[PDB]
Each structure stands twice: as C-alpha cells, then as structure tokens.
Amino acid sequence: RPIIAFMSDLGTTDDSVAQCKGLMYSICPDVTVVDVCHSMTPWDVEEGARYIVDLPRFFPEGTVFATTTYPATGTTTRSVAVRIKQAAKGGARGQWAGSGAGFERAEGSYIYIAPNNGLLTTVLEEHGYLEAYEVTSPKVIPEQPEPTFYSREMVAIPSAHLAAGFPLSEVGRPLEDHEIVRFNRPAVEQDGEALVGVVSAIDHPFGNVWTNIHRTDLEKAGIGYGARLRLTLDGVLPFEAPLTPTFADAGEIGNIAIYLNSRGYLSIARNAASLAYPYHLKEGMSARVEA
Amino acid sequence: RPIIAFMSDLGTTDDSVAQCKGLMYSICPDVTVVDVCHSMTPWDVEEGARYIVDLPRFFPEGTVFATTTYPATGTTTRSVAVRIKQAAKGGARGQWAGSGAGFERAEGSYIYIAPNNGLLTTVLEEHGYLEAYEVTSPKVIPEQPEPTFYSREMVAIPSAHLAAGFPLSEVGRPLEDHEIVRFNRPAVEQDGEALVGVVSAIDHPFGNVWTNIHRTDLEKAGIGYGARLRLTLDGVLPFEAPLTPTFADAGEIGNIAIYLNSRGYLSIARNAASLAYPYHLKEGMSARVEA
Amino acid sequence: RPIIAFMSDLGTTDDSVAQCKGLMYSICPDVTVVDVCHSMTPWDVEEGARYIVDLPRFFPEGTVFATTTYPATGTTTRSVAVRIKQAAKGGARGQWAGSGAGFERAEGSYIYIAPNNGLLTTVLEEHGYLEAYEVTSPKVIPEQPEPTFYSREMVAIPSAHLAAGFPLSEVGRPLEDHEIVRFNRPAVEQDGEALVGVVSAIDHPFGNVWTNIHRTDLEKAGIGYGARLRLTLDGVLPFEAPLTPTFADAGEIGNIAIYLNSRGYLSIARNAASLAYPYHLKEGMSARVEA
Ligand SMILES: C#Cc1nc(N)c2ncn([C@@H]3O[C@H](CF)[C@@H](O)[C@H]3O)c2n1
Ligand SMILES: C#Cc1nc(N)c2ncn([C@@H]3O[C@H](CF)[C@@H](O)[C@H]3O)c2n1
Ligand SMILES: C#Cc1nc(N)c2ncn([C@@H]3O[C@H](CF)[C@@H](O)[C@H]3O)c2n1
User: Fold this and answer.
1) Do C55 and A14 count as a contact with CB atoms less than 8 A apart?
2) Domain C186-291 class?
3) What angle is formed at CA C223 by the lines to CA C220 and CA C226, rounded to 5 degrees?
4) Contact A15 C259 (CB under 8 A)
C-alpha cells in the first residue's frame, strides 16, 4: 500500500535503477515502486521538473515522489524533503483525475524528495508546501555515501524510509524558503494583442509541440475554443488554425491542430502525424500566438 | 490477487504511463500492474495487435489487459471491453505455457479493454469472445474526459475498476459483433507449390524476421522440420535452408536459420547475428516460401 | 515477500518480457518482479555479467536473480541455478549498502539462475558459491520447452518456482565446478609502472568511461586520491587529471574528472558533459594509466 514514484536521469540500460529499487524493498518490503521515467536528459533540471509537477493528483494519498538528477553528487549538498500543500487541479479545464467527477485529494498528502538543485521549483509553485527539510540523519541516509551515486544514497534510500512512515521532521533541520534553490521560469510576455513564450517540450513519441503559454494566459487575452489563431514557432514558422479541444478536429490526416494539452498549455500538432520530427522542432524555440 | 497488463503507444520518456498507473493503484490498491510495452509505433493498430494477441495463456486467470493506441482520443468514440472465450494454445507446437505440461486456463478468464478501432481484431479471431460492451458508465470513466488522453481516461481508468471486480456487464450497453471495428488480415496465398505472404514483424532487438505464414499453412503444403526451403523476401532476396527448430541448428555463427517462431510462424534469422538490420528488412515486405 | 530480479536481452519493445512476468505471477502470485534491465547487447555475456554482479547487497535476503541471454536456446543445454556465498562489499571504498552503516547480508542468501554459458562468471568470482545445480526437473521447467525461448522456459519459469520456495537441490543434479562454463576475464597488466587494461563500459546515458582497472590495482602501484594521472584510451587519447572522488571536483563544466566509480573501478568523465559520445569511445578500447 505505500508507494514510491521514482523519476531519475539514471537511464534504463544498466543496473542503476535496480540497485535503488532493491534498497527500497529492503527498507520497506510492502512498498510499490512506480517508475515515472528514467530517460530525462542528464542534468537538465527544467526537463525533470516537467515530468514530476503533475503527478500528485493521479496517485493515492501518502505517495512519496523520489525525483533526481544529481549533478552535485559527492559534494556537501544534501537533499531536501518537502510535504506539498495542494495536489492542485490540472489538465485542459482544471479538474481532479479519475472516474466520475474525479478523486479529490487531501492537502499535505504527498512528499517529494529531491536534490536541492532547483528540481522542485515548479512543484512548489503549483502546489505550495507545508514543511521542508534538509535530509541529513544517518537513520535515513548512509554514513558513508557513495560519492558518484547520491541519487541512490540521498534520494532513493531516504524516500523508502519516508514511505515506511519515518517522520518527515526527523530527517534533518527545517529549511527557510530562500535555502531552497530555484530556477528562473521565463514569463509569458504580452506584445500588442500577441502572447510570446517558448516551446517547453516536444511530446514524444508523437512529435506534438507544447508551449509554456497557459490557458489562463489565453483567457486573459480574449482567446477560447473556436478562436482562429496564428502561432509562430522559431520566429519563422507561422501556423494558423482554430483552437480546438483535440487532434481529430483538424479534419484530414496530417492537418494542423492547435489545442490545449493535458496540462492546460497551448499546443500544436498534426492530426495522426508527427509535427516536430520532420521539421526538427526543439524545446527552447520561440512561440508567439495571436488572433 | 488482481492484475492489469498494460500496453500503450504512450512511450517511456515522460510521465504519461505513470499517471495511468497512479490512477490504477488509486482505484485498486492491491493490483499488480505489468507493463507489456509502451513503444509501439503510434496509431499502428496492426502492430499493437501483435503484442497483445498471445498474452492470455501466460497470465493468471482474471487478468485484465488494458491495451491502447487511441488516435480517436477526444471524439465521441468509446472503448470496448471484452471477455474472451479461449485462452488458446500457442507456440511452435500448440501447447499451454508453464512448467510440466503447462497451466491450462479456464474459458472466459480474461478481459481486454481497448479503443474500438480494430486493436482487438486478432484477439477475437484467435480467442473468440463471450461478451462485449461499450464502456460508457461514469462509474468507470470520467464525466469530463481529458480530450487528448483517452488512453488514460477510457482504457486505464476503467481497466482498474474491472480489475477491482466491477461487473463487466454494467460498463455500458452490449455490442453487436458488427459494431466491433476490425482490420483486414491479409490471407496467405498458394501459388503453384509455393505459399505467399508477408514479413509481419522484425523481432527486436535481434533482427530476426517473422512472416505471417503459419505452421498450419506449412503442413497443408507438405512441409515439416527437415524440409529444404526457398524463402524469398522482398521479391528478390531468395534464402535457402532446411526448416529447423532453432537458431543454433544453422551451424556456424552468421548462418541462415529458417525456423518456427514462438507463435508458430515461419521465420528467418542468422545464427547469433542480426539478419534484418544490416539489410534494412521491414515489416510489410513480401515473403514467399517453397520446397 | 519474495522477489525476482530479472535481467534479459529480450528488449523493451514487444511482449517477450511480459510473457515471462505473467508466468512468474502465475507460479508465485505474491512475488515482486524487479526489472534490472532488458537492453543488453544480445549474446554478449560479458556485458550481461556486468549488470548482475553487484546486485546482491542491494536486495533483501532470499531474492532470486533470473539473468539471461540465451543464444543456445533450443539446444540440449540446461540452465544452472547457484546459491552464492558472500553478498560481498562493493563500491569505491568497500562497504554494505543502505542507510546508517549499511544493511549487512547473511551468507547464502541469494540465488542466481542463468544459462550455463558464462554469464555468471564474475558473480562466482566476486561472491563464490555454496551449491550449484543443473536445472532439469519438469516440476520447474516445461516438458516441451519452446525452442526459441529458453530465456522464458529455462530461466524465468524455474526462477519463479525457486522464488516460491521450491528446494534448490531438487531442480536437478549437482554441478562440478568445471562443468560451470566461464569466460576469460582479461587481467590488468603492469608495464613499467603503468597499468594496462580496457574500457569495460560506457556509462549510459552520461557517456562516462569505465575501465577494468580496480582500486586494488591502483593502490598496489602507489596511486590514491590526489595522484596526478595520465590515462590513455585507444592507444592515442591521453588525458591528465588528478584522481578525485567525484565529477564536480573537476572545476568548470566540461572539465575532465578521473575518479573511482561506484563499483571501485578507474573511470573518466567530463564534469556535467558527456565524454564518450562526442568522441565515439567504445567498450573494448585499450586503457593505460600511470602517474
Ligand atoms: C557535474 C556532474 C556530473 N558529471 C557527470 N559526468 C555525471 N555522471 C553522472 N552524474 C550524476 O550522478 C548522479 C548519480 F547519483 C546522476 O543522477 C547524475 O546526475 C554526473 N554528474
Ligand atoms: C488523430 C490523431 C492524433 N494525432 C496526434 N498528434 C496524436 N498525438 C497523440 N495522439 C493520441 O493520443 C492518445 C492519448 F490517449 C495516444 O494514444 C495517441 O495515439 C494523437 N492522435
Ligand atoms: C545463437 C543464436 C541466436 N540467434 C538469434 N538470431 C537469436 N535471436 C534470439 N536469440 C536468443 O533467443 C533468446 C530467447 F530465449 C534470447 O535471450 C536470445 O539470446 C537468438 N540466438
């Protein structure tokens, strides 16, 4: 019944992840370990951030998220363990997840544990937190941590203790908000009637394009479903389409759909074809939208 | 103890699959989720069909197969949930799976749930079915399904309710056989003493080549183990070898083996080397066999 | 609760692994199956060896390691099942794994089951073994094993019986040490006061380079942390750096770190950048080190 959702940059090609898992079952034999993904670009905390920010509403209360890319492994840094506040609504409309009207989740029901290197920046933004600790107790980490494997020693091990009900406040000292490292999230700029941001992700394996322009950004510029839009990527690739709910509304196979993705962000795709791959579109390219 | 075997086109590079899983453990905390694979070519229902058709005999009775590529996500379509009839025999001979003489499986012991887009075509062919329903009840799907994620909303969510014993007949109305979408399976043609079909799959990661020419097709043309065969791929590449049980019977490393694969289909490989990759062989190429 | 750690060359792109798993839950419904990895280069027993040799100390006592690349599938060969002796200390220093001072593991607490094709060579070297059997009983393998799938029939099936407490000595006859196939581990040679070995692995996804030159080989040539080293790969690519504990000690991003990896072997990397990929370094290349 206790659950650890595990996200790393360790890859799926050797025994790394399994060593972490072995230890997790050693510390908490009834735990269920769920892989989020292990394929993130190493050291890109922004990319890791995206894969973990939306998890809580999908998981049972009490779930621990162990989340790590650890470029500072072997240094004096220590992980941070955080009890978030609201599981938050999400998606294209703003709802709970699940059958019926969804499963609503109590506040303070989820713990993230991560290197204190910015990885939880967006988790804290969207969810807030109740308490936050530096993870230092030798009860939950090794007295002699492997210098090149803090992902295992400083995240995976202690997440299993946490999953086994080890008290969050005993992992180490409390952290003041400014001691929690953040990365800068680039804002979405207004520019005439236009909104300007970036391609935040390519949606693998489909090659859909996700922007950082949220539905809230769109509504506060007079834009809802059915609005005819111009969406320019990379300064040069304009596209035009009405904003629709889904891919199939584009009509013919191959046609352009502009839609709100399952996180509520402005997105673009081809109907039953890949948009991004044939045109080598990339995370980071500009993205401008207007009616 | 209940099991969901999960097959999607969602990939292994983001949080998509994990969101489904979180929900599965939310709806049925004692469930075991087994990944079939998440790597299929998006929207290729024929390829998905292959990965799910042979599962039932390997799994404990009561197992639910949640299987999805969902190109029609966000439209008015609804999934179908089916209780299959026979778990069937399979493999190069026709047997149950497991130690000893195998574990034989009761009829009606398995449920598939899938978009109604053809994905279960071969499942129904090989296994038959007892009952089939459109999945519509808000008890097992969301009242507001995420338009771009029906794989989660219309397959994963309800599969967990089913796995938790939710009655199959209450998911929605019964479906007449003709309401269950099918794809055309191309038949194997006789042509003089020859049989003509197609390369159905490349067997990754080994680069073995699988055809659609079944052992039954071979026995009804006088062909058994030890028969010297000519197998022509792509109209032009005409291999010759005796039909053998396995790869190592080819003699030297690199040599050609023609054999019956673990599903009973005519196949070709190199002994301890990849056949398909150096020669860019592909699913879809012709395949002709004769003695 | 019983655990099977599963390592194969079957890949993650079809139903192969799932068929094994289905059977594992069929034979032992309370088992937890942990994927080590399924991505190894087919038939490369040396590569598989690396992924399994360090597992035991991470896992709870009683864990069964089912480990397989099975190029001799369909032949008269039979798997070997081995109860290892010491779980052994490991890592850059030599320690148990886990929080505090680690979880020490009783002798004889782990079983490996594998083709008898050399795959356990290094497991036996580093761990020793108490008992070893040929796996032949039809109680734990099929009477008609699928010729092309001994990985399932001769490893996965019997590993589940073993996991369920089936007595190890009843799987088949005992094996004399010389009946257990080994591969030659190339030794590390001294040359002047240089040490000469090979690149044993590229550490995906990071592109770090691992050699077969152990810390013990280094201490017995007067080399400890802080020693300024020359490390020449491929006969031609020299590098120089002090031997440090971790990556971040290299100073600037992109700079060269020479370190001891989490298994205790001499390694080289770039700080927060990939070393191996831009320069197409490969498993097998020479590796020479000196002060
Ligand atoms: C600066 C740098 C740095 N450089 C590397 N070459 C490197 N390779 C692996 N790591 C980190 O080691 C962690 C394992 F704990 C992984 O999560 C990685 O982030 C690395 N960090
Ligand atoms: C027409 C089209 C269509 N077009 C796309 N660009 C696309 N991208 C993802 N999907 C489907 O969205 C489903 C998520 F449930 C996945 O199973 C995919 O098959 C898509 N469907
Ligand atoms: C010689 C040769 C040989 N040749 C092949 N073309 C081949 N394809 C798959 N296998 C083995 O089939 C096993 C499944 F049991 C896998 O683990 C592989 O090692 C193979 N072995």
Assistant:
1) no
2) mainly beta
3) 160
4) no
Domain extents in chain B: 1-185, 186-291
Ligand 3 mean position to B204 CA, how many Å? 11
Identity of the residue in C55, C245, C246 whose CB atom sits nearest the CB atom of A22: C55
* Spatial CB neighbours of B167, under 8 Å, sequence gap ≥ 6: none
Architecture of domain C1-185: 3-Layer(aba) Sandwich (3.40)
Are B248 and C146 inside 8 Å of each other by CB?
Answer: no
Q: Which of A105, A162, A167, A170 is nearest to A137 (CA)?
A: A170
Chain A: nearest CA to C51, how far in angstroms?
5
User: How far from the centroid of its chain's Cα atoms is residue B89's Cα?
Assistant: 14
Among residues C71, C37, C32, C62, the alpha carbon closest in space to that of C52 is found at: C37
What number of other Cβ atoms are within 10 A of residue C121's Cβ?
A: 19
CA distance A41 to chain B (A): 10
| Residue B265, beta-bridge partner list | B214
Alpha-carbon distance C2 to nearest alpha carbon in chain A (angstroms): 9
Q: H or E segment at A49?
A: helix A45-52
Residue A204: nearest ligand to its CA? Answer: 2
- The CA-atom distances, in angstroms, between C59 and each of A28, B123, C4, C30 are 11, 38, 10, 17
From the CB of B149, is ligand 2 less than 6 Å away?
A: yes
3 state SS for chain B: CCEEEEEECCCCCCCHHHHHHHHHHHHCCCCEEEECCCCCCCCCHHHHHHHHHCCHHHCCCCCEEEEECCCCCCCCCCCEEEEECCCCCECCCCECCCCECCCCCCCCCCEEEECCCCCCHHHHHHHCEEEEEECCCCCCCECCCCCCCHHHHHHHHHHHHHHCCCCHHHCCCECCHHHCCCCCCCCCEEECCEEEEEEEEEECCCCEEEEEEEHHHHHCCCCCCCCEEEEEECCCEEEEEEEECCHHHHCCCCCEEEEECCCCEEEEEECCECCCCCCCCCCCCEEEEEC
C202 CA → ligand 1 middle, Å = 14
Resolution of the PDB structure in angstroms: 2.4
CB A54 within 8 A of CB A90: yes
What's A142's DSSP letter? B
Q: Do C19 and B248 touch (CB under 8 A)?
A: no
Which residues touch B74 (CB under 8 Å, ≥6 apart)?
A245, A246, A247, A248, A249, B145, B147, B148, B150
**How far is the CA of A221 from the CAs of A63, A210, A242, A291, in angstroms?**
38, 19, 15, 9
CA distance C73 to C176: 22
Q: CA nearest C245: which of A158, A76, A139? A: A76
- Cβ proximity of C26 and C125 under 8 Å: no
Taking CB atoms and an 8 Å cutoff, what residues of chain A touch B170? none
